[PDB]
């Protein structure tokens, strides 16, 4: 079941890629993009109490507007992970559906201090397809939050070193 | 609180998601959209403790365990997010682990690619990918057998001071 | 965060990456007035329990000692044969050179059977951007039935200057 393979599949051409898109967490719609999975400490009217988990199938679009070209999906879960200032842990992938990156994914395991940090860095822990052996990071930042409902648009920039 | 020989291995084995009958290797952790047809509805979470055999038969040589959770992750179709380790119990890689964070997409891709996100023991500094095809699937009842191919880079050995510990005493390699 | 990030455009290898050893104590507080965790789902920690944690990291084994970070995330009971944990967590540091920075961990944690448990660093942030390495956790102080614990951590990461 183990089988040592030779390293000599070696020399590969390196690429750099910058992605820029908009992440849509649609809470209150008639077609919302997430669902609460668990809420110990109950339901707050605008915050997320420590311990609650949300599954998420959030669209990634070229611009702030929902009509703009779909370009990927952010799927996974986020969890309220601070008993002090509200913070989240993102455990998700970003799956690309467009052009040269269709089918490829990037993996994220990151803390997300949405209450206090204006530009938030997230670590790329892995990639697939075009992003095999991906090495990079992301910077996230609120484009808008609607605190009536709780919908949010997050602007992402991705910096990823990888191969062709 | 602060201070300041790479190998490459192919692995082949079989992943046993066992839902039906006695001996279920998993359990459902939450389902906010109840039960569904032949699907886990969006938001369902399932804890696994799945055997890893050298061949597709349950009776086959057990060689590791796939431990973690998966979540049904699409509203448009059935897809999974795997958050898991593969912990091996045999051979050179006994006691070693690989970690996976990956989208599955079990209804749309024959071969599903998954990034190796890190490793332990013999797999320290692991980087690589997995490919997963079904050997056998039953979206009616749920269980399935999944073939895996893993190609992983990694390094061997150890580093090179000890603090007293009332439990474990001294030493640490040191 | 910071207004610029520099790095080497390699994919693999260390190029301009350095090596750091961290040592601290992880506080799993289950009982008493103010616990550091919450049970999230429960389909002593039976298979499938999910716990969310917000655990203080201190430079010594005392709660008293200087706070240097938080370990935050979820753990899950992942084993049917004995109590075993999957950790999905970040370590966020708040002191000294690595104030602001984080490390990500995705790891099995065989708390009943392994006196030293190795956990993969799968990512970092800020001063730990592109982090690679491992943590070693061993108990300093454990009560298996109440659940409280102090875990000694040694962390070895390669990361850039």
Numbering used by the authors:
A (entry chain C): 26 to 189
B (entry chain B): 26 to 29, 38 to 193, 199 to 212
C (entry chain A): 23 to 65, 72 to 189
Provide the authors' own sentences about this structure as they appear in the paper.
Described herein are the 3D structures of two stereoselective pterocarpan-forming DPs from pea and licorice, which preferentially produce either (+)- or (–)-medicarpin, depending on the substrate. We describe that pterocarpan synthases, containing dirigent-like domains, initially engender mono-QM formation from their chiral substrates, this being followed by intramolecular cyclization (C–O bond formation) to afford entry into the pterocarpan natural product (phytoalexin) class. GePTS1 and PsPTS1, in solution, exist mainly as trimers (∼68.0 kDa), with (because of association/aggregation) a small amount of higher-molecular weight entities also being evident (roughly corresponding to 410–500 kDa). The entrance to the putative active site of the GePTS1 and PsPTS1 monomers is located at the end of the barrel opposite the N and C termini.
The GePTS1 structure was solved by molecular replacement at 2.6 Å resolution. Six independent DP monomer molecules, labeled A–F, were located in the crystallographic asymmetric unit, arranged as a dimer of trimers. The buried surface area between the two trimers is small, and the biologically active form in solution is presumed to be a trimer, as confirmed by GPC analysis. The GePTS1 monomer is an eight-stranded antiparallel β-barrel comprised of two curved anti-parallel sheets formed by strands β1′, β2, β3, β4, β5, and β6′ (designated sheet I) and β6, β7, β8, and β1 (designated sheet II) that contact each other only slightly at the β1′-β8 and β5-β6′ interfaces. Currently, the GePTS1 structure is the only one that shows the trimer without requiring it to be generated by crystallographic symmetry, being found as a dimer of trimers in the asymmetric unit. For example, in GePTS1, the cavity volumes range between 350 and 500 Å3 (calculated with ICM-Pro) and are lined by predominantly aromatic and hydrophobic residues and two aspartate residues (Asp50 and Asp83). The roughly cylindrical active-site cavity is long and narrow (around 7 Å diameter) and nearly parallel to the 3-fold symmetry axis of the trimer, where Tyr181 sits at the base of the tunnel with its hydroxyl group projecting along the tunnel axis. The conserved polar residues in the active site of GePTS1—Asp50, Asp83, Tyr103, Asn137, Arg145, and Tyr181—are likely to facilitate this mechanism. All four GePTS1 mutants, when subjected to comprehensive kinetic analysis, displayed large reductions in catalytic turnover.
